[PDB]
From a paper:
The Gag polyprotein, composed of MA, CA, SP1, NC, SP2, and P6 domains, is the sole viral component needed for the assembly and release of an immature virus particle, which is accomplished by the oligomerization of Gag into a lattice structure at the plasma membrane. Cryo-electron tomography (cryo-ET) data has revealed that the immature Gag lattice forms a spherical cage of interconnected hexamers where the CA protein plays a critical role in stabilizing the spherical hexameric lattice before the viral protease cleaves the Gag polyprotein into its individual subunits and maturation occurs. CA is composed of two domains, the N-terminal domain (NTD) and the C-terminal domain (CTD). By contrast, the immature CA hexamer is stabilized by both CTD-CTD and NTD-NTD interactions and adopts a more extended conformation with a six-helix bundle at the base of the CA-SP1 domains, and the immature lattice is stabilized by NTD-NTD interactions that mediate the inter-hexamer contacts.
Utilizing PFO-treated VLPs, we obtained two BVM-bound immature GagCA-SP1 structures, which include: (1) a 2.10 Å resolution structure with both LEN and BVM bound to T8I VLPs; (2) a 3.09 Å resolution BVM-bound structure from NL-MA/NC VLPs. A comparison of the two structures reveals that BVM binding in both VLPs is consistent. To better interpret the averaged density, we modeled six symmetrically related BVM molecules inside the cryo-EM density (left), which was then compared with a surface contour generated from the symmetrically placed BVM molecules. This led to accurate positioning of the BVM model consistent with the “up-orientation,” where the dimethyl-succinate group is oriented up towards the CACTD. However, the location of the bound BVM is more distant from the IP6 binding site and closer to the SP1 region than previous structural studies proposed. In this binding mode, the betulinic acid moiety of BVM is positioned to interact with residues ranging from I231 of CACTD to T8 of SP1 in NL-MA/NC VLPs or L231 to I8 in T8I VLPs. However, the pose of the bound IP6 molecule is altered when BVM is present. Upon BVM binding, the density for the axial phosphate of IP6 is no longer in the pore center. Interestingly, the density for residue K227 suggests potential alternative side chain conformations, where K227 can potentially either interact with the succinyl moiety of BVM or engage the phosphate of IP6. The binding of BVM does not alter the structure of GagCA-SP1. Alignment of the GagCA-SP1 models from the apo immature Gag lattice and the BVM-bound Gag lattice, showed an RMSD of ~0.6 Å (RMSD ~0.4 Å if excluding the flexible CypA-binding loop region spanning CA residues 88–94) (middle).
Author numbering:
A (entry chain L), B (entry chain K), C (entry chain J), D (entry chain M), E (entry chain G): 12 to 239
Amino acid sequence: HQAISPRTLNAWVKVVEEKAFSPEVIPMFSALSEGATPQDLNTMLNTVGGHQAAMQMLKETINEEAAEWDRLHPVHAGPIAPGQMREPRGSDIAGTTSTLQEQIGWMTHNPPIPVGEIYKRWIILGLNKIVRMYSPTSILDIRQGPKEPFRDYVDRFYKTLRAEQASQEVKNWMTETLLVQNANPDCKTILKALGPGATLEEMMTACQGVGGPGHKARVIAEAMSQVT
Amino acid sequence: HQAISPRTLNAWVKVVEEKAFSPEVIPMFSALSEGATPQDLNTMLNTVGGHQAAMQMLKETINEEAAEWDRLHPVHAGPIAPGQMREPRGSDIAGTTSTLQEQIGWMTHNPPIPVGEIYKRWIILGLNKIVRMYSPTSILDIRQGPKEPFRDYVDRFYKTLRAEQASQEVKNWMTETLLVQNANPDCKTILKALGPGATLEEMMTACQGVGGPGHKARVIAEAMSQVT
Amino acid sequence: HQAISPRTLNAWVKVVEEKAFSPEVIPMFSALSEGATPQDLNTMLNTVGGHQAAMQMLKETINEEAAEWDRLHPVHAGPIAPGQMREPRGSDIAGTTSTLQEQIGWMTHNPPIPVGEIYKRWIILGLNKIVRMYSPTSILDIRQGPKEPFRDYVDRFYKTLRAEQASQEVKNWMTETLLVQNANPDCKTILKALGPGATLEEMMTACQGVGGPGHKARVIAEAMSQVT
Amino acid sequence: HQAISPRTLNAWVKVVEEKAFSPEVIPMFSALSEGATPQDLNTMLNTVGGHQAAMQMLKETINEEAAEWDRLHPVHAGPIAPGQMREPRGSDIAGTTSTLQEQIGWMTHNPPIPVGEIYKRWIILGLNKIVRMYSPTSILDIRQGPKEPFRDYVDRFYKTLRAEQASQEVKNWMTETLLVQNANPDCKTILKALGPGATLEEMMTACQGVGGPGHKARVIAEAMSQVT
Amino acid sequence: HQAISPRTLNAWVKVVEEKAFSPEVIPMFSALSEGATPQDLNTMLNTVGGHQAAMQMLKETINEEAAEWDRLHPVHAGPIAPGQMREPRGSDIAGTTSTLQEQIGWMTHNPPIPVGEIYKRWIILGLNKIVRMYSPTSILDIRQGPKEPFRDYVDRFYKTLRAEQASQEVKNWMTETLLVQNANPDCKTILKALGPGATLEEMMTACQGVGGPGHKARVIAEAMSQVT
Ligand SMILES: C=C(C)[C@@H]1CC[C@]2(C(=O)O)CC[C@]3(C)[C@H](CC[C@@H]4[C@@]5(C)CC[C@H](OC(=O)CC(C)(C)C(=O)O)C(C)(C)[C@@H]5CC[C@]43C)[C@@H]12
């Protein structure tokens, strides 16, 4: 049997990262998965890096459809007759407790039990649910809350950037611009009043006092003096 | 033998989606599953999307009624009758344990044990409880809290919007109007200060200030100046 | 043989409803259906609710391709063939004049005559034409014509709104806002002169005179007063 | 066999005429007709007076479901049937082809064929379509169009009044009230200028020339005089 | 036998959509189709997309020529002729009631019956009538009538645009630059007074009032003020 080529896996993971589970991933997933055994489907699903929420949703959908298949399709009791073997359970279709040899036997037997296409249908349902209900996070969509500490947002921004898929120079440029650009107006004002090019430690120290008693009293004083 | 059809099941899910678990769903259900085997009832009940809380309540009702049936109706001592007939335990009425063939045999046996009717009654009780206490959520119910950050409110708004059953055009229109309509007065005045047609990122950048020390000082000073 | 399942069919109906015959339905149809007998895609198409014009265009396309298939493939000589059953026609590939046993025999015969794949291709062409040409209707597209009386406007608005797929609360909200949001400047002026919270009957009564001699005289007199 | 009874049928007609295909007619239909042969439900549907569009939609849905049943369930090969009677079809389940004896034989066979329940399910789907789509017409809904001549408005009013089910004194009261209560501002003004108690012929004579050159010129001149 | 090839058929389709039934299509049809069996020209004519009126006229011409051929050539006596196969008929030359084997046998016989050239002559006559009479519809021909409401104008404009042969970017440019260019002086001046870059919905809202009592009164009063 023909397994999944490494170039196929690379293309699948690349489209996964590039489209960020856009609807355009639904067609692509079909195109490179035609005639694929459920073990190959599981391998092609596992290599997707990141997007843990999407993987959780897809696994939940797979489990739901496997349970439905188990309920609708019963099992046969008794010794297995020669010329045949065990009927595919829901997990067998999902490729969790079915060996590759058994899956290939199911596909190539006459009449053929389409374990691969049923599994692909379950994964397609999961992917449709994902593209309907999943909104990817990005370094552009992480900002600082009105009362959130500056240090905590710096740590969260660094974690999100470390989770990003981009070149090192691009990430450094994003650190240079977005950090000051996307911040609490108080934190942004403190950073902008400070000279550009200040180190991260200095910009954290300058914003370490944001939200404290002294800063609140000072800003109240400025507001009261300005209005009056 | 008799089995459910795609048309009736589609109509059932459509009426469930249309009326948000209103009382009008109790008759229609009982009007669609007449003479239905428990497996057909389970398939009818598991196909409704959304309303996870209501479905959880209905399920819990099913388990409690199955436990009551098991308590009231005892099981045999263990030996099997020469007629090869098994008394239906509480679990298998709901279809979790028994298969389609066993349910059909029970429903066709003389005298008939209408397991489908008992399961339908249990599901009816669950639906009655659902309409009694459970209330579905809606996009119009999403309102920004008094101390809520704008980013979290937008996240909640879009999370509820994605699961809502509607078309893309109406969804975009609701995004355009409701999101700025339902907002904190502090957030709403800032949004109204911005001209119409401002993008979502501009809205969030403008509203990032509310609840922070600077915004609080500004509103306090403005109110003090206006009063005196 | 494994036929369609309620989950996949319901997902197909849901994706059709959510995206009103957007291009994204072309791959999903190619993904949910695989190895499906012509009766299976017939069920897959019939359960689609609404979009009667689109379904009519799809049916016309299927008739066109069936006629072309009949034209290109003639009747084999010999009405009786003990070796193998009859050859497919244009209509029975579409499933109108075929039984499930015959379709299964065709798709399983050696060599295979994939009536399912050919029918799927015909429906794919139909959906491509649909997404190329058909424009879905929506409640926001309902707008009062300049000379349209308010009563027929309201009748059309409620007809499309009731044909719309949504919830009761959001439908009531649409009735509250869009009815006066989409109206002629004369009817809009009359309704704005009415205080907010006026009933539908009050609004219909207030706009009964739009287009009559009394209105067409009063507006002209007001304009003459304004410009003189 | 116990067929339908005059009390249940009369109550069915009464409830349909009372709530006018409100959702509350869905349970009663499933309540007043249980165990009914398809001829009984055919009689139940035929005796309904009025609501021609509703019955149009209902029986259209009935033919749709019958065609779907014919598609899914094929004619059994071999006209010979010595052991038992013929298998049902869509039309002969809907009652338009089978006889009462055949329906009774099916509904009491071993195993039974629930012809009555299937037909009741089809009528239930049709009734749900009615209550979702059909809006009853009422005398209070008759309003004169802005450019509609008074004679045709009166003709429409009296046509729907005759179609209305009420008492003669009640109908006379509706004639006395709604005729002048539902009219264009021009016709309303003309009628109010007429003294109360004017006959219908005098009322029609007074509004015979609304929309003619003389009336339009008179109202335009009055508006000009008021403005200047 | 050498049937038609995809390249020539695609070229024929391309020239038809390029010059839109200009006279230059008459030679190409006689050049691409040489020695073609009637089935080949039937395929050549069916693949033509658009120009439904022109194809209907061509079908009418073919029917007329077939009727004339049947009139001038009678059906020879003798139900069965062992010496030679049957003689052609009017509808048979068009390929409606003939198979490819029969057409090949006729076009290759001693003496030959040139069914292909006769059918080609009929299609050439039809094409000549088409190029003489039929005028293709284009997007530039869509102009809104003096009394046409703007909404139906936009509907017609998009309906004809959606059937064009252009690309997406040029289609968007044509929407941007042609909708306002082809409009009534009233609608055009409303759109010019309205700021450039306004959305389609804003434009439709602006021109919703054209043709109503308020707009007519306003323009009449403006003209009266101008000339007095
Ligand atoms: C008495 C007055 C106070 C003033 C003092 C003298 C006057 C002036 O100096 O102003 C001379 C001009 C007139 C007479 C006005 C009165 C009004 C009229 C009128 C506004 C009347 C309504 C008519 O409109 C129609 O015909 C309606 C329409 C839809 C077009 C249809 O049915 O065809 C038109 C033709 C538009 C005229 C124009 C001429 C003027 C201005 C006079």
